Amino acid sequence: SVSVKATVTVKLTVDDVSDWLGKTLLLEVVSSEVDPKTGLEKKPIGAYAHRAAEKDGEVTYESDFVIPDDFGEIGAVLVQNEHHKEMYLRYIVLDGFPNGPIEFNCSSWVASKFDDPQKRVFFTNKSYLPLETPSGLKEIREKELVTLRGNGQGERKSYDRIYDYDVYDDLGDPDSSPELTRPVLGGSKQYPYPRRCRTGRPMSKIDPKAETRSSTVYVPRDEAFFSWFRDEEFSRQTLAGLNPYSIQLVKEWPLKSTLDPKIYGPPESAITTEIVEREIKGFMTVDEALKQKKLFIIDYHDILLPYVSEVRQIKGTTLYGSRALFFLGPDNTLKPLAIELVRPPMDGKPQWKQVFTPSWEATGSWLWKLAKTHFLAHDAGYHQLVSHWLRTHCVTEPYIIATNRQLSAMHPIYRLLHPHFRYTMEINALAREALINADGIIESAFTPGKYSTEISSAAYGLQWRFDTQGLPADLISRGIAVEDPSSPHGLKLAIPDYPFANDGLLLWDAIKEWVTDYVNFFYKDASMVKSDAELQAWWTEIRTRGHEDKKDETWWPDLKTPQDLIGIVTTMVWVTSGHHAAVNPNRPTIARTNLPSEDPTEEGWRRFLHKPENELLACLPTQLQAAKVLTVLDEEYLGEHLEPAWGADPLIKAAFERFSGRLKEIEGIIDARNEDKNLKNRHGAGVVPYELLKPFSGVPYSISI
Amino acid sequence: KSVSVKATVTVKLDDVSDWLGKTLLLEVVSSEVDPKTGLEKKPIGAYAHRAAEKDGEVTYESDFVIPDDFGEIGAVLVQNEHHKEMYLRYIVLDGFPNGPIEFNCSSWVASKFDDPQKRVFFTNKSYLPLETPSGLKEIREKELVTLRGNGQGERKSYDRIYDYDVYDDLGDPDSSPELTRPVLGGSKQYPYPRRCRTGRPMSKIDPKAETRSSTVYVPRDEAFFSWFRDEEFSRQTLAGLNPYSIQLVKEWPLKSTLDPKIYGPPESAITTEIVEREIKGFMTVDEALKQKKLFIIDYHDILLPYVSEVRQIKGTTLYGSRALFFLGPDNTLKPLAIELVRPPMDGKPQWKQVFTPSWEATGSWLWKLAKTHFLAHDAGYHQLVSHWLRTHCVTEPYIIATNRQLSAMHPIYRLLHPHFRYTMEINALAREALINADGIIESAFTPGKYSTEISSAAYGLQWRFDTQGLPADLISRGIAVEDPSSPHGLKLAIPDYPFANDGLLLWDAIKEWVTDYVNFFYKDASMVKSDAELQAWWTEIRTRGHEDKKDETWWPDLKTPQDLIGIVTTMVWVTSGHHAAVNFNRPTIARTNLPSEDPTEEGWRRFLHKPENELLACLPTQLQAAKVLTVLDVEEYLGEHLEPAWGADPLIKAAFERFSGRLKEIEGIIDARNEDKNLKNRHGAGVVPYELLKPFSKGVPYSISI
Ligand SMILES: [Fe+3]
Ligand SMILES: [Fe+3]
């Protein structure tokens, strides 16, 4: 009774002799309603689609069939690829109804039926919680989730769309040499770690706990593709550089190591009140500075000192546990006070510990430059492995796996999360292949060498917790902020001109208001959150499987109210857009020689005095290592593009326009801040404007690099 | 009977035919007059003949006969028979029962067609005028008369005539009225030391200007970015090429002496508050003053009167400037502040700002730009005052008076002579191409065409003979106080001060050599006062060579041996020690104003966006640096060579050996100091060892030789 033309749009990219001629695709429409007489699903109705037109890398397939006028609203379309090669389906359009066309967004590779004979399903752009699902779609919605989970076994093939978890047992290459054997990260008290996508390749015969290496790493198919010589620029970079996440408030004094003195030597810092007051007493005493929150620190001592011994056995690198202390001065800019470098007892020698400060005599000033060199190598490694790799790439992949395993593609929270997870799993597979692997790029150019990835595991174990990954909680956790209802964004900042925090809190508020509007459209109260079985499964799986090694921690948010959900989703989206943008180049990634003042010989010391430039070049990365890191630095912006389903709900579309507008407003706010003579951490002679968090030239919406 | 004398003249390498065919007339002159008449004895000699040649040397030989009653030979006469001059090294007389007699010559002897007058050379024995052997008294006087000339005529290249004139030869008003320069010397407005008279025509355009020439006469025998680092900026005030400017801060707050009716408020903008922000973790400002921990390089009052006119020159600017330093507990200097001042001009108020090391980008860049201006000022002052004025320029009048008034036979002439070598010729070259209108200095230094005038201002306002000796200079600047129990009898407020520490070693060694030498010839005050040559010498220095200061009461008296030792030790220090320390890099000009001086919105924005571009626009151009560094690219040393008269006298020779040994000692002391980890102003990471005053090679020459 109803004639329907189905049009499929396919994108071109570069056994086929026996392709079924003129029957490339089988298309079947699915009714939204069960047969009201029996309660069972109606049979899908369909026909084959043949090639119809090619224009500029785009191919049309057409199918013509008849549907009874009581079939019901079409809520989904089933597709089978009859030919031997996969095809990329853009979208499907159903013409011929009196209600106008229906678009189905596909954006998917459809495997050859000879690789996978299961039919693919595409739902309309209308989104539903599970209990609100039209009765004709309930079982196919569930069956599709089952398909994406797979069954936990098998070597994953390129055409698979199977999402599941496995530990990091694929970074070493014991089959090439035992020297390339690396510990498994994940599944143990000593090496806790987020899980990654399961690949299922055979385990190695030389190292049984290792998964064999491969030149191709599976992801589910649709996931595939010297300024610091200036003390004031060294300091400003802690607030507006690429690693704005390390600086924290000094509360205790004197500074004291938490490590075991019986293994690590005296725990008390060598930074004294006398050293600091010689520098700042023209403004205030140390006691006043502590009370008035003017002392700030980047403290890598306790995390790095337990690795010093192992790392020092590696030719061409060294290590110290380090601290960098800063005074917040009268222009609200940071002044470097001191750098402390510590070697623990090793090789019959006691703990070695020295403090370096800015200096107006030549030797002290050269030791200061070398001290900054070591500290900057530590901060470069911490930035790359923790601020960047761990806290964006690594911890996010389990969220992506869980999203595809437990949230239907027609679930509203799936469609909110979806664009913020694009390209990450593939980038992460590339990182396991060539960045964080044994003798990969990090190990060969960074201070910790083969111990680098283990250090990210220690940072995960000791420090990572979901509830401080949102920007307010992170600032609060570091002593930079306290809650204050009057103050802008509800936060009083001890560092008021903190370009990363200032611009980030604008982005954070806009994202949160968008997530709030979006959640409130679909979840009207707590009972709708509590009764969402896909949502509950998703959050339970993230904690108990994706982050299994921390599943018993008490800091995991509950998921019982719309506000709980808003908090979880805002955190995830912030991480994939703003956090990642803020951590994406003069700094050394490795310091290859010890300080000249570390157990000097008479003639080693004299060589340093005679040619300290040579000592600096011996410490700095080789021009090859630097050329390695730099050359290794290899879509649309946040707020530019509507997802098909957002644009289909008029209220969701309106919320997105308000989001886009706030982002544009923030662009103008940031541009004005970069012109403000009072914001000396972003405006000043030679000071590059702070634009890392500026929308629209730009903030990406996902971790794509 | 009689004695057979073999006279041998050694000559260093005119047309060939005259060269080989003509020779010399050599005569010997008795030391004593005829004892029966008081009359001079006629000299005796004969014409020479070529005897030997080797290694660039020709030897002429004269053989003649002398009466046995002739007496001791006190001189030889030489008459060149070539029609070209000839350089005589030394003369030896053989055949006397007592042995050879050597006469040192070291003198060009003119062609007889230029000057037919015979040349006289005295033996190596030295005499005060009253001790001159009777046969030599007249010739000793006649020689001085010859060397003075008559004050007239254009001097020619074969002349041996020493006399004075003003610096009226630096401009070129025969090219442009813009190349006119004021006469330096002889007026209240432009006091200056005199220079050697050349006697060329005066300009018809500018009648007070001597006409320019490509050849300048001298008497014939006179002719031949580290500071980006604050720690090196401040260390160079003590161990760099201009260690002469730093002074103790005496008054607080700082205040100009210039008339406020013309130059604006005199109070410095450097305040207690600014300094206390930097040093309170060490001590209060009040205690830093009381404990002599605050030091300054203060060019404000000498430079401020030139600022208005220098700023009218395209491509440069000027401020009056001060740089303030704090001596910390490791006895290293921390720079505190730079003050830059513009006087009221163009109906605008005095502009005055202070710059300090800073904890934020804009203040840090402004500090670097202010360092750039002050360093250009320090460079100009070093070049024009510490170097040109205080060594070259004030010394030339001593050289003129020495030749006009001290006999070549006089012991003090023979003490001074090596320390005066090459200076007159170099100074001539400077008048020709360095301090002349549109010369190297005017073209590459901040003051432009006002550069030489500023050296005249420094001479008129600051130069005094009695503070040119090193102890007096350090006491004058507040660096030292007299203290019997301290080394050299001076307690230094900057104890690690490489120039001063090393310089005081040199000073004492020179002073005891001069003391030994003077005491050999002047046994009491009566011998100093009755020395008519020495008195005329000192009178000519004060009333002619330094005529514009003739009335100052700080001129040393010259009545006692100790007066003479003071005077000569000062002169020798200046020609050797002082010159070595400032001669053997920084910008010489800063071409644009500080960005913070009357900024416009767009000018300020440009500076913020590209400060490195602003630095380059301020710094010297590549040509200006080339001219300087190419010119700045251009003999034996102190304690190395005995003068002939010094070797001739056993006690003086012994005194020189002690002098030489002390200098060798001082070398080892200085090498030890450059390895002392406690002496952070000369030893440290990347610190070049301080060797400018190290005897026996950067080398202490005995004279201002370059
Ligand atoms: Fe990344
Ligand atoms: Fe010189």
Residues ending a continuous segment of chain A before a break (C–N > 2.5 Å): 14, 225, 584, 634, 697
Phi (first) and psi of residue B54, to 5 degrees: -170, 150
Find where tokens 């989703």 sit: A569
- Tell me the sheet residues that pair with B352: B341
Find where tokens 């002073």 sit: B511
Closest CA to A45 of A26, A32, A30, A34: A30
* Cα distance between residue B551 and residue A557, in whole Å: 95
Q: Which residues of B663-673 are buried (b: 16+ CB within 10 A; e: fewer)?
A: beebbeebeeb
- Report whether A298 belongs to an annotated binding site: no
Partner residue opposite B277 with nearest CB, options A282, A333, A608: A282
Q: DSSP character for B633?
A: T
* Cα distance between residue A400 and residue A568, in whole Å: 14
**Does the bond joining B253 to the residue before it have cis omega, within 30 degrees of 0?**
yes
Phi (first) and psi of residue A510, to 5 degrees: -65, -45
Asked if A566 contacts A524 with a C-beta cutoff of 8 angstroms, the reply is no
Closest CA to A113 of A138, A93, A136, A86: A86
Tokens of B337: 């502040």
Tokens of B685: 């990471």
* Cα distance between residue B131 and residue B144, in whole Å: 17
**Does the bond joining B207 to the residue before it have cis omega, within 30 degrees of 0?**
no
Tokens of A317: 């690198």
Closest CA to A223 of A373, A331, A379, A107: A107
Which residues of chain B neighbour A684 with C-beta distances below 8 Å?
A: 360-362, 608
Nearest chain B Cα distance for residue A680, angstroms: 7
Asked if B353 contacts B366 with a C-beta cutoff of 8 angstroms, the reply is no
Q: Is residue B26 part of a domain?
A: yes
- For A305, other C-beta atoms within 10 Å of its C-beta total 22
Cα-Cα-Cα-Cα dihedral sign, residues B654, B660, B663, B668: negative
**SS3 category, B336:** strand
Considering only residues 258 to 287 of chain A, which have any Cβ-Cβ distance to chain B shorter than 8 Å?
277-283
Reported as half-sphere exposure (CB side, CA atoms, 13 A), residue B575 has a value of: 28
Cα-Cα-Cα-Cα dihedral sign, residues A579, A581, A585, A588: positive
Chain A interface includes B616 (CB < 8 A): no
Chain A interface includes B332 (CB < 8 A): yes
The per-residue DSSP string of A391-458 comes to IIIIHHHHHHHHHHHHS-TTSHHHHHHGGGGTTHHHHHHHHHHHTSSTTSHHHHHSTTGGGHHHHHHH
* Cα distance between residue A199 and residue A218, in whole Å: 6
* Cα distance between residue A210 and residue A203, in whole Å: 6
* Cα distance between residue B70 and residue B42, in whole Å: 10
Q: Is residue B527 part of a domain?
A: no
Ligand with minimal distance to A584 CA:
1
Asked if B192 contacts B184 with a C-beta cutoff of 8 angstroms, the reply is yes
Nearest chain A Cα distance for residue B490, angstroms: 26
Q: Is residue A547 among the annotated active site residues? A: no
Residue A335: exposure state from Cβ atoms within 10 A (0-12, 13-18, ≥19):
buried
Which residues of chain A neighbour B680 with C-beta distances below 8 Å?
A: 361-363
- Rg over alpha carbons for chain A, rounded to the nearest Å, is 29
* Cα distance between residue B602 and residue B599, in whole Å: 8
Tokens of A99: 């209600």
Amino acid letter for position B326: F
- Report whether B392 belongs to an annotated binding site: yes
* Cα distance between residue B512 and residue B666, in whole Å: 14
Task: Count structural domains, chain A.
Answer: 1
**SS3 category, B421:** coil
Q: Is residue A73 part of a domain?
A: yes
Asked if A8 contacts A89 with a C-beta cutoff of 8 angstroms, the reply is yes
- Report whether B419 belongs to an annotated binding site: no
Write down the experimental method used for this entry.
X-ray
* Strand extents, DSSP E, B211-315: 247-248, 294-298
Chain A interface includes B226 (CB < 8 A): no
Q: In which element (H, E) is residue B53 found? A: strand B49-54
Task: From residue B366, give the alpha-carbon distance in Å to each of A333, B96, B369, B612.
Answer: 17, 79, 5, 12
Tokens of A578: 């703003």
Q: Is residue A428 among the annotated active site residues? A: no
Q: Which long-range contacts (CB under 8 A, 24 or more apart) does B238-241 make?
A: B238/B333, B238/B494, B238/B496, B238/B497, B238/B498, B238/B499, B238/B500, B238/B681, B239/B498, B239/B499, B239/B681, B239/B682, B239/B690, B241/B382, B241/B581, B241/B582, B241/B583, B241/B692
All residues at 6 or more sequence positions from B191 whose CB lies less than 8 Å from its CB, including other chains: B185, B456, B459, B460, B548, B549
Q: Return residues with CB closer than 5 A to ligand 2 (ion).
A: B 583
Q: How far does chain A reach from its first CA to its final CA, in angstroms? A: 52
Q: Is residue A94 part of a domain?
A: yes
Task: From residue B353, give the alpha-carbon distance in Å to each of B258, B377, B598.
Answer: 18, 17, 11
Which residue of chain A is at minimal alpha-carbon distance from B596? A685
Q: Is residue A584 among the annotated active site residues? A: yes
Which residues of chain B neighbour A356 with C-beta distances below 8 Å?
A: none
Closest CA to B25 of B118, B158, B115: B118
Interface test with A, best of B359, B371, B596, B602 (most A CBs within 10 A): B359
- Tell me the sheet residues that pair with A66: A3
Q: Is residue B115 part of a domain?
A: yes
* Strand extents, DSSP E, A484-556: 491-493
All residues at 6 or more sequence positions from B661 whose CB lies less than 8 Å from its CB, including other chains: none
Closest CA to B684 of A451, A389, A368: A368
- Tell me the sheet residues that pair with B268: none
Asked if A669 contacts A693 with a C-beta cutoff of 8 angstroms, the reply is no
Residue B207: exposure state from Cβ atoms within 10 A (0-12, 13-18, ≥19):
exposed
Task: From residue A455, give the alpha-carbon distance in Å to each of A341, A346, B37.
Answer: 18, 20, 113
Q: DSSP character for B701?
A: B
Q: DSSP character for B345?
A: B
Nearest chain B Cα distance for residue A296, angstroms: 15
Contact at CB, B685 and A365, closer than 8 angstroms: yes
Which residues of chain A neighbour B686 with C-beta distances below 8 Å?
A: 362, 366, 609, 611-613
Asked if A107 contacts A85 with a C-beta cutoff of 8 angstroms, the reply is no
Find where tokens 């936990």 sit: A152
Asked if B219 contacts B161 with a C-beta cutoff of 8 angstroms, the reply is yes
* Cα distance between residue A554 and residue A588, in whole Å: 38
Dihedral angle of Cα A5, A11, A12, A18, to the nearest 10 degrees: -40
- For A329, other C-beta atoms within 10 Å of its C-beta total 19
Task: From residue B303, give the alpha-carbon distance in Å to each of A544, B192, B320, B374, B403.
Answer: 79, 18, 5, 11, 37
- Strands B44-47, A481-483: pairing is unpaired
Partner residue opposite B685 with nearest CB, options A230, A334, A609: A609
Closest CA to A596 of A394, A370, A444: A370
- Strands B57-67, B49-54: pairing is antiparallel
Find where tokens 């380059």 sit: B616
Asked if B595 contacts B607 with a C-beta cutoff of 8 angstroms, the reply is yes
Tokens of A12: 């071109």
Which residues of chain B neighbour A683 with C-beta distances below 8 Å?
A: 608
Closest CA to A420 of A397, A440, A443: A397
* Cα distance between residue B244 and residue A557, in whole Å: 72
Task: From residue A683, give the alpha-carbon distance in Å to each of A102, A499, B520, B603.
Answer: 52, 10, 74, 16
Q: Is residue B45 part of a domain?
A: yes
All residues at 6 or more sequence positions from A499 whose CB lies less than 8 Å from its CB, including other chains: A239, A240, A244, A673, A679, A681, A682, A690
Interface test with A, best of B225, B228, B284, B360 (most A CBs within 10 A): B360
* Cα distance between residue B133 and residue B698, in whole Å: 44
* Cα distance between residue A219 and residue A208, in whole Å: 23
Contact at CB, B362 and A236, closer than 8 angstroms: no
Q: In which element (H, E) is residue B231 found? A: helix B230-239
Dihedral angle of Cα B345, B346, B352, B356, to the nearest 10 degrees: -110
- Counting every residue, how long is chain A? 705
Chain A interface includes B605 (CB < 8 A): no
Reported as half-sphere exposure (CB side, CA atoms, 13 A), residue A700 has a value of: 19
Partner residue opposite B332 with nearest CB, options A331, A360, A612: A360
- Report whether B410 belongs to an annotated binding site: no
* Cα distance between residue B298 and residue B338, in whole Å: 10
**What's the gap in Å between A705 CA and the centre of ligand 1?**
4
Q: Is residue B56 part of a domain?
A: yes
Nearest chain A Cα distance for residue B668, angstroms: 19
Residues ending a continuous segment of chain B before a break (C–N > 2.5 Å): 13, 224, 584, 634, 697
Task: From residue B43, give the alpha-carbon distance in Å to each of A367, B54, B64, B66.
Answer: 78, 31, 12, 10
- Which CATH number do you get for residue B59? 2.60.60.20
Asked if A104 contacts A123 with a C-beta cutoff of 8 angstroms, the reply is yes
Asked if A61 contacts A25 with a C-beta cutoff of 8 angstroms, the reply is yes
* Cα distance between residue A409 and residue A128, in whole Å: 10
* Cα distance between residue B668 and residue A27, in whole Å: 100
**SS3 category, A559:** coil
Contact at CB, A360 and B608, closer than 8 angstroms: no
* Helix, strand, coil percent values for chain B (each to nearest 5): 40, 15, 40
Resolution in A: 2.0
Q: Which residues of B117-135 are buried (b: 16+ CB within 10 A; e: fewer)?
A: ebbbbbbbebbbbeebbbb
Q: Is residue B77 part of a domain?
A: yes
* Cα distance between residue A186 and residue A174, in whole Å: 18
**What's the gap in Å between A297 CA and the centre of ligand 2?**
53
Q: In which element (H, E) is residue B353 found? A: strand B351-355
All residues at 6 or more sequence positions from A411 whose CB lies less than 8 Å from its CB, including other chains: A127, A128, A129, A130, A534, A535
Partner residue opposite A612 with nearest CB, options B234, B612, B686: B686
**SS3 category, A22:** coil
Task: From residue B278, give the alpha-carbon distance in Å to each of A365, A693, B253, B274, B336.
Answer: 18, 36, 17, 7, 7
Asked if A153 contacts A200 with a C-beta cutoff of 8 angstroms, the reply is yes
Asked if A115 contacts A35 with a C-beta cutoff of 8 angstroms, the reply is no
Chain A interface includes B353 (CB < 8 A): no
The per-residue DSSP string of A54-116 comes to EETTEEEEEEEEEE-TTS--EEEEEEEE-SSS-EEEEEEEEE--TT--EEEEEEEEE-BTTT-
* Cα distance between residue B196 and residue B424, in whole Å: 8
* Cα distance between residue B491 and residue A279, in whole Å: 30
| Residue-number span of the structural domain to which B96 is assigned | 2-122
Amino acid letter for position A610: H
Tokens of B622: 């590549």
Asked if B558 contacts B347 with a C-beta cutoff of 8 angstroms, the reply is no
* Cα distance between residue B588 and residue B12, in whole Å: 43
Amino acid letter for position A678: N
- Counting every residue, how long is chain B? 706
Which residues of chain B neighbour A360 with C-beta distances below 8 Å?
A: 230-231, 234, 328, 332-335
